[PDB]
């Protein structure tokens, strides 16, 4: 039984999912991160807490590389 299921690892950004586990330090094997904090807050909420100048800083695509595991390719774009 899990009282207080922990929150996702790196959920710290207001309008994009947390990076997948493993990349943050966790279990590999899944590509796409997801955090129920983000998906529940309605869209306007996610657009309230953030200004356009900010989303362009967390939209930010570090395409092949991974922003967290410095020097290694992002593990949501590899074959697995």
């Amino acid at each position: 039984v899990a009282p207080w299921v922990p929150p996702p690892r790196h959920d710290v950004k207001v309008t994009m999912p947390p990076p997948p586990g493993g990349e943050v330090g966790g279990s590999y094997g899944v590509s796409t991160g997801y955090s129920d904090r983000l998906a529940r807050t309605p869209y306007w909420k996610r657009m309230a807490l953030s200004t356009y100048a900010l989303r362009m800083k967390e939209n930010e695509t570090r395409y092949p590389m991974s922003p967290h595991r410095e020097g290694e390719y992002d593990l949501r774009y590899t074959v697995t």
């Binding site: 306007w44 909420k45 657009m47 309230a48 200004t51 800083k57």
Partner: protein, 184 residues
């Protein structure tokens, strides 16, 4: 007593009378009218009948032939179904009795008036050595851009003396933004 075992057994069956059907189980709106002190006095009377009917029906069961079925067999249906009525009326009182107790005790938790090594806890504002400022900004600015600026300048730690900076939006805005997102 000798005659005490007579309240185990029905009066009519001893007296060969055609037994009379019941009047009716206890109604609910008339039950909650009754305090708890007597809700058991009206319970043992349901009790001392469900015994006084069962001992009859197992007697008619033991001699199915000589006596046949138990006369007025719906009585025992109207005593169990009346027991459940008392069961759900106390369960009503012992709902709010509980819910008012949990509402108190759960505001003594955050009150902190408990302490095992029995005594009065230390004063409330002694432990916190913290000061909080509600800085209000027109536009949003990035968090770490605040932590660099409004943070202390004397302490050589990445936390820069500032325990935790948190941007928030007043609920008058979280709706002033909510509709102007809808009317848009």
């Amino acid at each position: 007593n000798v005659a005490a075992l007579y309240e185990f057994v029905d009066g009519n069956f001893l007296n060969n009378k055609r037994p009379a059907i019941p009047g009716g189980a206890w109604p609910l709106e008339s039950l909650r009218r009754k305090s708890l002190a007597d809700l058991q006095q009206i319970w043992l009377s349901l009790l001392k009948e469900r015994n006084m009917l069962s001992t009859i029906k197992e007697h008619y069961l033991r001699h199915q032939e000589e006596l046949g079925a138990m006369p007025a067999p719906s009585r025992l249906k109207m005593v169990e179904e009346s027991m459940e009525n008392v069961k759900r009326v106390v369960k009503e009182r012992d709902a709010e009795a509980t819910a008012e107790a949990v509402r108190i005790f759960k505001e003594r938790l955050a009150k902190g008036i408990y302490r095992y090594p029995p005594g009065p806890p230390p004063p409330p504002g002694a432990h916190d050595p913290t000061s909080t400022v509600k800085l209000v900004l027109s536009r949003r600015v990035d968090e770490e851009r605040l932590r660099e600026l409004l943070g202390r300048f004397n302490v050589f730690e990445a936390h820069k003396g500032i325990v935790k900076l948190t941007m928030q939006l007043p609920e008058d805005v979280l709706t002033q933004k909510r509709d102007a997102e809808q009317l848009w």
